[PDB]
Write a protein that binds this ligand. Structure first.
Ligand SMILES: CC(C)(O)[C@H]1CC[C@H](NC(=O)c2cnc3cc(OC(F)F)ccc3c2)CC1
Ligand SMILES: CC(C)(O)[C@H]1CC[C@H](NC(=O)c2cnc3cc(OC(F)F)ccc3c2)CC1
Ligand SMILES: N[C@@H](CCC(=O)N[C@@H](CS)C(=O)NCC(=O)O)C(=O)O
Ligand SMILES: N[C@@H](CCC(=O)N[C@@H](CS)C(=O)NCC(=O)O)C(=O)O
Lengths: 199, 199
């Protein structure tokens, strides 16, 4: 069996998709969480200076979604056909594009709060509406069963709701999708034991 | 055989990776390029309001890298092992993260030029150095043969060099990698017939 070590900050953030996948597939791993103080040292040892990274039998993988895709290959989370695997990838990237717009690392709280509130007020409702229309009356975002795109929806929406609690008031179908992901036994079991962090 | 129709603006931009893949695999397709004037109408018909899109026997795929990955599955461009396929994905996303930082759509030329010059002066050299160190003395970025990560390197660097011609003066190994991609017969054949656009 592979010996997995995940390194990230002590937060859900970009590592959480990987953590959900390990939970669903019942894979034991080391969930190494670093303090901000240790980051400068660690950063200088990494080929691209970013986390998360996943060490697999000592070899270092990077890029959260590249890693997530790797872990889901030949599993029920991948997507059931080659084109549905493309749809999974496309939804994940649509979500990731938006999350990547937020100035997470910005130091000036004034401009940071202003930019968060712009994105959440003007851009977020538009994306929520497109996702809701895309989902329509289907059970899951892609195909006839849960995929890691549904996981990423729940993760991303969980963080957006911290800043904008009314985000999904006009989207009961997207709320239902969150609840369905949160109710999957392995995911529910992870949610109830994970460290509690704002982000 | 699949009937492919690619829709994008009249530019290399985000569609070019797909165009290189079709060239390499010797796949005929419709390269539909829209004028800015027609975009409002077309945009309102798309599930996520963005291009490129690829219609495959009438069914619409979106997200440039999702599409690229779909087209390279079960081909020699994918990566030779499952972990090398993860490395391909990770390099592509590292490149894409940086290209996605540029305010391509910004209307105020003053702030746009300032932001381009900040990214190109302060961030670009750092990434170039990380890529150069990652490549080291290997022939290609991943494994022992060309992958679509090498294609995306060449595409992204081609556009960066428009704005910063000295970008690779300190990176002869990255220049060599560009030339090797540009010399692949099917790619060279595409480069010599493609429409000539700034971006
Ligand atoms: C070291 C230094 C400067 O202090 C960092 C500042 C930025 C910090 N990052 C976040 O706060 C953060 C939180 N959540 C995210 C969720 C995302 O989407 C997810 F849902 F995948 C994507 C990116 C996210 C980034 C980490 C420390
Ligand atoms: C309709 C409206 C407002 O006029 C648009 C403005 C922005 C326009 N987009 C670009 O100019 C452009 C060019 N190149 C790119 C290269 C990239 O990386 C690549 F190498 F894949 C990624 C994004 C890029 C975007 C398209 C029209
Ligand atoms: N697209 C990459 C983004 C990685 C990234 O930028 N990570 C941030 C934290 S969320 C980071 O390492 N920031 C610290 C730094 O740049 O010093 C991924 O999904 O893995
Ligand atoms: N990550 C997406 C980005 C798609 C995207 O934002 N495309 C731009 C053009 S490069 C667009 O459609 N802009 C026009 C608009 O938003 O109205 C991809 O790679 O396909």
């Amino acid at each position: 069996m592979p010996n997995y070590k995940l390194t990230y900050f002590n937060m859900r953030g970009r590592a959480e998709i990987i953590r959900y996948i390990f939970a669903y597939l019942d894979i034991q791993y080391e969930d190494h969480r670093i303090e901000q103080a240790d980051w400068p040292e660690i950063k200088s040892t990494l080929p691209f200076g970013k986390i998360p990274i996943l060490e697999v039998d000592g070899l270092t993988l990077h890029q959260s979604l590249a890693i997530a895709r790797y872990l889901t290959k030949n599993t029920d989370l991948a997507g059931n056909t080659e084109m549905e695997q493309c749809h999974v990838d496309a939804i994940v990237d649509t979500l990731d594009d938006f999350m990547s717009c937020f100035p997470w690392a910005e130091k000036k709280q004034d401009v940071k709060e202003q930019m968060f509130n712009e994105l959440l007020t003007y851009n977020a409702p538009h994306l929520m509406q497109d996702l809701d229309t895309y989902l329509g009356g289907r059970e899951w975002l892609i195909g006839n069963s849960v995929t890691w795109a549904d996981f990423y929806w729940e993760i991303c929406s969980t963080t957006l709701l911290v800043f904008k609690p009314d985000l999904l008031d006009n989207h009961p179908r997207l709320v239902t999708l969150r609840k369905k992901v949160q109710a999957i036994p392995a995911v529910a079991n992870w949610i109830k034991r994970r460290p509690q962090t704002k982000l």
